[PDB]
Amino acid sequence: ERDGLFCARIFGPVKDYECLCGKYKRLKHRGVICEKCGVEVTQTKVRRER
RNA sequence: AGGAGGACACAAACGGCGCGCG
DNA sequence: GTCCTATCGATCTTCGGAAGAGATTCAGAG
DNA sequence: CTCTGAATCTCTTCCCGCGCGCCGTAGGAC
Ligand SMILES: [Zn+2]
């Protein structure tokens, strides 16, 4: 759930390299910001550091 | 006649309680 | 049945630790 | 009247692995 303790756009996406909203599923769109959910697509590991 | 035209990737978790062994 | 909110917001959470160390109070003490 | 004594307060601590095995949100409102 967004804006929660596990918000995707706050801490990071859950999928390996895919955004939560599913707009992008490739390294070709790595680093871009989606506007279907607001989550930033990057390496999911960053989710443990933000 | 002549002549003309014509989908890749991907293998199980975190805290108690109890027991037991070194 | 589902999904909810809230968590002794009318109790009594255990009495079979020891100690060791500070920290905090008190007590004649001038 | 506080000072510099004790005395009485709370807090911290307690070997290493290893296996079994269970056991693990709750009551209330639409
Ligand atoms: Zn997305």
Side-chain angles (χ1 to χ4, degrees):
Chain A
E1 188 137 343
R2 65 194 303 265
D3 290 85
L5 294 171
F6 283 73
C7 185
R9 83 176 192 269
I10 284 183
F11 304 105
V14 282
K15 295 296 182 300
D16 312 324
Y17 244 111
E18 168 218 340
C19 61
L20 185 62
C21 68
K23 263 174 164 49
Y24 319 101
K25 299 189 179 65
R26 194 83 161 182
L27 318 177
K28 185 184 165 298
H29 317 78
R30 172 180 58 178
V32 318
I33 297 182
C34 79
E35 59 170 352
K36 190 192 170 195
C37 186
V39 59
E40 174 183 0
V41 45
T42 172
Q43 303 157 349
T44 174
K45 158 175 49 60
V46 190
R47 185 174 162 82
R48 91 192 322 264
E49 199 231 347
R50 291 197 250 187

